Amino acid sequence: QFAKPEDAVKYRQSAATLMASHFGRMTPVVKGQAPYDAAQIKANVEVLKTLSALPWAAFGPGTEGGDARPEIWSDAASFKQKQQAFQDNIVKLSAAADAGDLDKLRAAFGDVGASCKACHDAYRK
Amino acid sequence: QFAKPEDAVKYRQSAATLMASHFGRMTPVVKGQAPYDAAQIKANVEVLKTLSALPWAAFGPGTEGGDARPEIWSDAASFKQKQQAFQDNIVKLSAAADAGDLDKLRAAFGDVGASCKACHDAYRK
Ligand code: HEC
Ligand code: HEC
Ligand SMILES: O=C1O[C@H]([C@@H](O)CO)C(O)=C1O
Ligand SMILES: O=C1O[C@H]([C@@H](O)CO)C(O)=C1O
Numbered sequence: 001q002f003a004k005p006e007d008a009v010k011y012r013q014s015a016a017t018l019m020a021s022h023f024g025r026m027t028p029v030v031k032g033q034a035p036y037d038a039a040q041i042k043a044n045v046e047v048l049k050t051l052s053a054l055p056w057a058a059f060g061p062g063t064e065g066g067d068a069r070p071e072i073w074s075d076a077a078s079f080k081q082k083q084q085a086f087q088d089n090i091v092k093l094s095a096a097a098d099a100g101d102l103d104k105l106r107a108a109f110g111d112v113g114a115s116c117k118a119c120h121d122a123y124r125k
Numbered sequence: 126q127f128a129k130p131e132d133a134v135k136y137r138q139s140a141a142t143l144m145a146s147h148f149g150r151m152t153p154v155v156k157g158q159a160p161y162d163a164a165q166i167k168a169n170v171e172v173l174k175t176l177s178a179l180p181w182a183a184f185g186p187g188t189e190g191g192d193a194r195p196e197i198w199s200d201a202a203s204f205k206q207k208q209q210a211f212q213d214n215i216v217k218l219s220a221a222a223d224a225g226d227l228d229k230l231r232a233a234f235g236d237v238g239a240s241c242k243a244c245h246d247a248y249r250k
Contacts, residue, residue, distance in 0.1 A: 001150035011146050014139035018179070021136050025126035045192045054143070 008063035015054040022048040023112065030106040040099035045097040052090045056083045067125040079123055086115040133188035140179040147173040148237065155231040163225035170222040177215045181208045192250040204248055211240040 002008040016054045022044055028034035031042065059072055059079075089112045098102035127133040147169055153159035154166065184197055184204075197204045214237045221229035 001146055007146075010142060017139040018143065021126055021132075047175060047179070050172060054172070092229060104128040 002058070002060075002063065004019045005063045005065050008058045008060065009066040009068075012055045012058035012068075013066060014020065015051060019048065019051050019055075019116075022051060023109075023116070026105075026109060030102075030109045036105075038097075041105065042097045042100070045094050049090060049094055052087060069123045069125055072123050079119075082115075082119040082122065086112070086119060089115045127183070127188065129242045130190050132190045133183045133185065134191040135194075137180045137183035137193075138166075138191060140176060140183065144173065144176050144180075146240075147176060148234075148241070150199075151230075151234060155227075155234045161227045163222075166230065167222045167225070170219050173220055174215060177212060194248045194250055197248050204244075207240075207244040207247065211237070211244060 004009065026041065026044065029036055059068065061073070064070060064073065089108070093105070093108040093112050096108040127136065151166065154161055170214065184193065185199070189195060189198065214233070218230070218233040218237050222231040
C-alpha cells in the first residue's frame with residue numbers, strides 16, 4: 001500500500017508511536033500508581049492488540065530505511081520469530097486484561113515489554 | 126496519557142498517518158483498478174474502524190500545537206460534531222464492507238472522504 005519505501009517507513013514509525021502510547025500508558029496502572037479499572041484496561045489492550053499487528057507488513061521487500069536494520073531482511077526468519085513471539089505475548093496480555101486480574105496483567109505487561117526490547121536490541125539501529 | 130502537549134500532537138499525527146494509509150489504500154479498489162476481495166476489505170475497514178476512534182482523545186485541553194487550529198478548542202461542540210459525523214460515516218463504511226457490496230463500498234468511501242476533508246477545511250491549519 002506504499003508508493004515509495006519512505007511511505008512504508010513513515011507507516012511503521014507511526015504504528016510504533018501508537019503502540020508505545022497504548023503500552024506505556026499502562027505503566028502507572030501496573031505499578032499501582034494509578035487505579036486499576038479492569039474495563040478500561042480491557043478496552044485499551046484491545047486497541048493495542050490491533051496496533052500490534054500493523055508494523056510488520058510495512059517491512060516488505062525494498063522498504064529498507066528509517067531505523068530498521070538491514071538484518072530484518074537478510075534474516076527474515078529470525079525477525080519473523082521476534083514478531084510472532086511479541087504477538088504471542090500480546091495474546092497473553094489480552095487474556096490477562098480480559099480476565100480482570102492485575103497480578104496477571106503486571107506479569108504479562110512485563111513479558112510484552114521484554115519482547116519489544118529484544119526486537120529493538122537486535123533489529124533497530 | 127501524554128506527558129507534554131507535544132506528545133499529544135505526535136500521537137494524533139501518527140493516528141492520522143495510519144488512517145490515511147488504511148483509507149487511501151482502498152482507492153484503487155473503489156475505482157476498480159485493483160480487484161475487490163470482500164474479505165480483504167472487510168478486514169481493512171475493521172482496522173480503519175479502530176484507528177478512526179483514536180485521534181480525538183489526543184486533542185484534550187492544553188494540547189494546542191501541530192497543525193490543529195485553535196478553533197478546535199474554542200468551538201468544541203462544532204468540532205465534536207465533525208468528529209462524530211465522521212465516525213458515523215465510518216460505521217456506514219463498515220456496514221458496506223461487512224455486506225460485501227462494491228457499489229455500497231464506493232458510495233460509503235466517498236462519504237468518509239468528504240468527512241475527512243470537511244474537518245480539515247475547518248480545523249487543520
Ligand atoms: C520487531 C519484531 C519489533 C517489535 C516486537 C517491536 N518493535 Fe518497535 N521498532 C522496530 C523497528 C525495526 C523499528 C524501527 C522502524 C523504522 O523503520 O525506523 C521500531 C521502532 C519503534 C519506535 C520508534 C518509532 C519512531 O517514531 O520512529 C517505537 C516508539 C517503538 N518501536 C515501540 C515499540 C513498542 C512499544 C513495542 C512493543 C509493545 C515494540 N516497539 C515492538 C521493531 C520492533
Ligand atoms: C476532525 C473531526 C478530523 C477528521 C474527521 C479527520 N481529521 Fe485528519 N486531521 C485533523 C486535524 C485537526 C489534524 C492536525 C493534527 C495536528 O495536530 O497536526 C489532522 C491531520 C491529518 C493528517 C496529517 C498528519 C500528520 O502526519 O501530521 C492526515 C494525513 C490526516 N489528518 C488524514 C485524515 C484522514 C485520512 C481522515 C478521514 C479518514 C481524517 N484525517 C479525518 C482533523 C480531522
Ligand atoms: O513503552 C515502550 O516499551 C518498550 C520498551 O521500552 C520496553 O522495555 C518501548 O520500546 C517503548 O516505547
Ligand atoms: O486519504 C486521505 O483522504 C483524505 C482526503 O484527501 C479525502 O478528500 C485525507 O485527508 C487523506 O489523507
